[PDB]
Amino acid sequence: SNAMQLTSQAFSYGRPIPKKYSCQGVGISPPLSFSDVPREAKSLVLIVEDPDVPPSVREDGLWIHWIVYNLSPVVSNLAEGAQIFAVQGLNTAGEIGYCPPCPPDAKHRYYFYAYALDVVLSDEEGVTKEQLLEAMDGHIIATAELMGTYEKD
Amino acid sequence: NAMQLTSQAFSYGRPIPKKYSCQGVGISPPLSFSDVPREAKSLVLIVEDPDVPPSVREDGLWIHWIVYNLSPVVSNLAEGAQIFAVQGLNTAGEIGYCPPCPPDAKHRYYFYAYALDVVLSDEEGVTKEQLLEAMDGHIIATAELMGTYEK
Numbered sequence: 001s002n003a004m005q006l007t008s009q010a011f012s013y014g015r016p017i018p019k020k021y022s023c024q025g026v027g028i029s030p031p032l033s034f035s036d037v038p039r040e041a042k043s044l045v046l047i048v049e050d051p052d053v054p055p056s057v058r059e060d061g062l063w064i065h066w067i068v069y070n071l072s073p074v075v076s077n078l079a080e081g082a083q084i085f086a087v088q089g090l091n092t093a094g095e096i097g098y099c100p101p102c103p104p105d106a107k108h109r110y111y112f113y114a115y116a117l118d119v120v121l122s123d124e125e126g127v128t129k130e131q132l133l134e135a136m137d138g139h140i141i142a143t144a145e146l147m148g149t150y151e152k153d
Numbered sequence: 154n155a156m157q158l159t160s161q162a163f164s165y166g167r168p169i170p171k172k173y174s175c176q177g178v179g180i181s182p183p184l185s186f187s188d189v190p191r192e193a194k195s196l197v198l199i200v201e202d203p204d205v206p207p208s209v210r211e212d213g214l215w216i217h218w219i220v221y222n223l224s225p226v227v228s229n230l231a232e233g234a235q236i237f238a239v240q241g242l243n244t245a246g247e248i249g250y251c252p253p254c255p256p257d258a259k260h261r262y263y264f265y266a267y268a269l270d271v272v273l274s275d276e277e278g279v280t281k282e283q284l285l286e287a288m289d290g291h292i293i294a295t296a297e298l299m300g301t302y303e304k
C-alpha cells in the first residue's frame with residue numbers, strides 16, 4: 001500500500017485479542033507485522049496502551065502495556081513472545097517489557113501505535129513513554145495504528 | 154477478519170477485462186469491500202500502475218483513480234458507477250478514473266482500499282500526495298486488489 005501498516009495475524013482492527021496474549025492465557029506478546037515502512041526510516045517504535053484502564057487506579061486514564069524502540073525498519077514480523085532485537089522501555093507498572101491485557105471491570109481497547117523515524121535514538125535503558133515521545137520529536141515520518149479488544153470471560 | 158477488496162470482474166493477479174481498459178468503453182471496474190472495521194468513518198480508494206514506462210513517467214508510478222470519503226458501508230461500486238464520494242486527480246490531470254492503456258508490456262494495476270477513523274475535508278483537485286498526507290494517523294485498515302492488463 002501507499003502507507004505504513006501495523007497488523008496482526010492474531011486479530012483484525014477492533015476485534016478481540018486471543019486469550020493466549022492476555023493474563024487468562026500464557027500472556028505472551030502478540031504477533032505483529034510492520035509493512036510499507038518508508039525507505040527513509042532508520043528505526044521503528046511501538047507503543048501499546050489502554051485508554052480504558054479504570055480511572056480509580058490511573059487518574060490520567062492511560063496504561064502503557066509495552067514500549068519498544070530502535071527496532072530495525074526491516075524487522076517485518078515480531079512473532080508471538082519473540083525475542084526483541086531492540087530496546088524495551090517501561091510499562092506503567094514501572095517494569096520493562098510487555099504487560100498482558102487483564103481488564104478487571106469491562107471490555108477494554110488496546111491501541112498499538114507504530115512510528116517510523118528518520119533517526120536511530122540514543123541507546124538508553126528505563127525509557128518511559130514521556131521520554132520516548134520527546135526523543136522522537138522532529139523525527140517521525142509515518143505512523144500506523146492497530147487496535148484489539150479484551151474482555152475476561 | 155481482515156478487510157478485503159475484490160472484483161467480480163477479476164480475481165487477484167488476473168487480467169482485467171477489456172471493457173475497463175482503453176481498448177473498450179473504459180469504465181471503472183466493479184469493486185466490493187468486505188469486513189470494513191466498525192470504527193471506520195470513511196473509505197479511500199487509490200488505484201495506480203507501478204509498471205508505467207519510466208520514459209513516460211520518471212517516478213515510475215501512474216495514478217489511475219483516487220476516491221475518498223466513500224461511505225464505510227458503501228459495500229460495492231458497480232461498474233462505471235456514479236460515485237457518491239469525492240474523486241481526486243489522476244496522473245493524466247483529470248478527475249476520476251483513467252483506464253489501463255499500457256503501450257509496452259503487461260502492467261499490474263494495484264487497487265488499495267483504506268478505512269479511516271475520520272471523514273476528511275471536502276476539497277477539489279485533491280492529489281494522491283495531499284490525500285496520503287492527510288490520511289497519516291487515521292488509517293485503521295488496508296486492503297489490496299491487483300489485476301493486470303496487456304494489449
Ligand SMILES: [Ca+2]
Nearest residue numbers: 162172183232
Ligand atoms: Ca456484464
Ligand SMILES: [Ca+2]
Nearest residue numbers: 245246247248
Ligand atoms: Ca481538464
Ligand SMILES: [Ca+2]
Nearest residue numbers: 238239275276
Ligand atoms: Ca459534498
Ligand SMILES: [Cl-]
Nearest residue numbers: 008009032033
Ligand atoms: Cl503478525
Ligand SMILES: [Cl-]
Nearest residue numbers: 050101102103
Ligand atoms: Cl488491562
Ligand SMILES: [Cl-]
Nearest residue numbers: 161183184185
Ligand atoms: Cl464487485
Ligand SMILES: [Cl-]
Nearest residue numbers: 202253254255
Ligand atoms: Cl496504462
